[PDB]
Design a protein around this ligand. Structure first.
Ligand SMILES: NC(=O)c1ccc[n+]([C@@H]2O[C@H](COP(=O)([O-])OP(=O)(O)OC[C@H]3O[C@@H](n4cnc5c(N)ncnc54)[C@H](OP(=O)(O)O)[C@@H]3O)[C@@H](O)[C@H]2O)c1
Ligand SMILES: NC(=O)c1ccc[n+]([C@@H]2O[C@H](COP(=O)([O-])OP(=O)(O)OC[C@H]3O[C@@H](n4cnc5c(N)ncnc54)[C@H](OP(=O)(O)O)[C@@H]3O)[C@@H](O)[C@H]2O)c1
Ligand SMILES: [Cl-]
Ligand SMILES: [Cl-]
Ligand code: NA
Ligand code: NA
Lengths: 317, 317
């Protein structure tokens, strides 16, 4: 009899409870949301599935072997005190990845094609042909070449965009020019549409700012460069996005993530011209997908196979 | 000395004149818009580039060897009296094709992802997460598997959609289920998003009607099926689109082409929920591309090589 899995996910409690009924069927779960677990013995607990966990969890469960992230980032856990020196496994999923690419490609196309202008004219019953360059005349610069960035690059290339990439260590992608950390300025100067798919770390906090927007390509086929972010909202300075759009440094933006969520009702971003807002719904983590992932990684671990998608603890993602 | 090419293109006269200055440099052109050509001898004329040509053109130029269509359809010439029994060459172009696929993919994604709802909420400063199935759960049925349809199919598949096709004769496309003329009802019943890329012929006039919309899949992942048309506007019955959307037979539409263009200011389509209108700017024919195409086909013909993209005169496209 294997011990039950500890689950402390601070989102959608009724959904977590329901979906747990059919999860971990060989061992069960300990849902930290249940008041009946306030005094529970976690000394045998091997695996913990955590999203914004209680600060004292590691004192209560000192013999954990693996922590599984309960969402698609680890910024919710990576900085907390007393985080044990054991593997932390990211949540990744094929359906999530392909849905991020749908969003990224759609946003890039809407900027390329002038969706804002088309919509504005449509609402006013105005027939107004727009000029748009073909995708090959426009360079999309993808920042982050991980699971999401690699998929987005491939699909943007199929749609015809010129695509370049930037990541901390240069990533080899056949047929795509790729740049490493220190080449940021060179990469920005080549980029017409910036696509942000970075994790949140100290290095990427407040990273998309005024100075960065002013380094994007100014003489490209869209006229003015565009900023897209679906990584983490705390990576951008929203007041600088607003200023950049107003001043013509940016021609537009698409944002799925915000410094504070939900985005404040009074944010200037809602009504800014050529800006598309989605309410952090580009590619959400879902409970069944999460539990299948964790179950699979436990099955691997219990065969003595390596855990997959283990974060780089020193790098923080 | 080869005879000049006859040009009678009833659109953008000043643009045609300007672009002709650098076209056909080994022989020149006869622009039928120039009043100085009212009495011109066309007895030596070999090639004619025509878009909505004068009705008496073939009487004036009785020795033509090839007619080149001056736009990306031939419905503007195919039905006219006295059209000679000589090859009629379509205008086709790689940049046009890839731009149609940008539009098609963008429209399919905007329906998949709920762009209408996202935009509506954004305008009202409302944070409102939407649910959308991944593309693989949705079947796009592409009607027309020619130059445009084949490109759209390939790119929709890369984005993850399930894709099926319909054409007059079944077209073999590796990995895509394809249907022939008589299998229309079966094809419609499998289709969640209909993508129309048909030419205008008698058989396709008034083809997208109430009866057709009621045959689309009703129990699919989008809830209600969607109608997209970027072929020819006279292929659809707009009042039936309006009724179908109002009644919930269609969940939405995207239209680049209309029965009458420009679309009447009072059309109900402009303000219909979940309907996207573009003003026949999905993939326009452009003058330099047209002239390069015609010049190339003349070069082939004068080597004794076959003309490409010759229409099927009996089929009418
Ligand atoms: N909006 C949504 O719904 C949504 C959904 C899922 C995920 N996300 C976010 O998207 C992020 C990315 O996901 P992923 O799976 O693609 O991540 P991943 O596989 O961990 O890849 C991260 C990429 O970012 C790069 N990177 C990290 N720090 C960097 C730095 N300081 N400078 C330059 N590049 C840096 C990495 O460089 P190396 O290749 O050199 O390591 C790597 O290429 C997640 O962490 C999450 O925050 C958002
Ligand atoms: N919105 C725009 O900006 C824009 C731009 C360019 C073109 N267009 C329009 O798009 C059309 C399609 O272009 P294309 O280059 O892809 O054409 P294409 O290469 O001629 O292919 C036409 C396709 O339609 C099919 N078809 C024709 N009549 C049919 C019928 N009665 N039943 C079933 N299928 C039928 C053909 O079947 P088979 O394969 O059996 O022959 C073929 O697959 C053009 O004719 C033009 O009207 C629009
Ligand atoms: Cl602000
Ligand atoms: Cl009507
Ligand atoms: Na500001
Ligand atoms: Na009607």
């Amino acid at each position: 009899v294997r011990p039950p899995v500890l689950v402390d996910i601070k989102f959608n409690p009724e959904g977590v409870d329901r979906v747990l009924k059919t999860a971990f069927a060989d061992r069960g779960s300990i849902n930290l949301a249940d008041p009946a677990n306030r005094e529970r013995d976690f000394s045998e607990t091997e695996y913990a599935l955590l999203w914004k966990p209680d600060a004292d969890l590691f004192r209560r469960a000192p013999n954990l072997k693996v922590i599984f992230s309960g969402g698609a980032g680890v910024d919710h856990i990576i900085g907390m005190a007393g985080l044990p020196d054991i593997p932390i496994v990211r949540f990744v999923d094929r359906s999530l990845t392909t849905r991020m690419s749908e969003w990224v490609v759609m946003q890039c196309l809407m900027h390329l094609r002038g969706q804002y202008g088309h919509d504005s004219h449509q609402r006013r019953r105005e027939w107004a042909k727009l000029i748009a360059p073909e995708a090959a005349e426009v360079t999309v610069g993808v920042m982050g070449l991980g699971i999401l960035g690699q998929d987005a690059v491939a699909k943007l290339k199929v749609m015809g965009f010129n695509v370049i990439g930037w990541s901390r260590t240069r990533k080899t992608i056949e047929g795509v020019e790729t740049f490493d950390a220190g080449e940021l300025d060179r990469f920005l100067a080549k980029t017409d549409i910036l696509v942000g798919l970075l994790p949140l770390t100290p290095e990427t906090t407040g990273f998309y700012d005024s100075e960065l927007f002013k380094k994007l390509r100014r003489d490209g086929a869209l006229g003015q460069p565009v900023f897209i972010n679906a990584g983490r909202g705390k990576s951008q300075i929203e007041t600088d996005i607003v200023s950049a759009v107003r001043e013509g440094t940016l021609g537009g933006a698409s944002l799925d993530v915000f410094e504070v969520e939900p985005l404040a009702t009074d944010s200037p971003l809602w009504e800014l011209e050529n800006v598309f807002i989605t309410p952090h719904d580009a590619a959400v983590s879902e409970e069944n997908a999460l539990f299948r992932h964790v179950e699979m990684q436990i099955a691997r671990f219990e065969r003595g196979e390596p855990l997959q998608f283990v974060i780089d603890r020193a790098a923080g993602y």
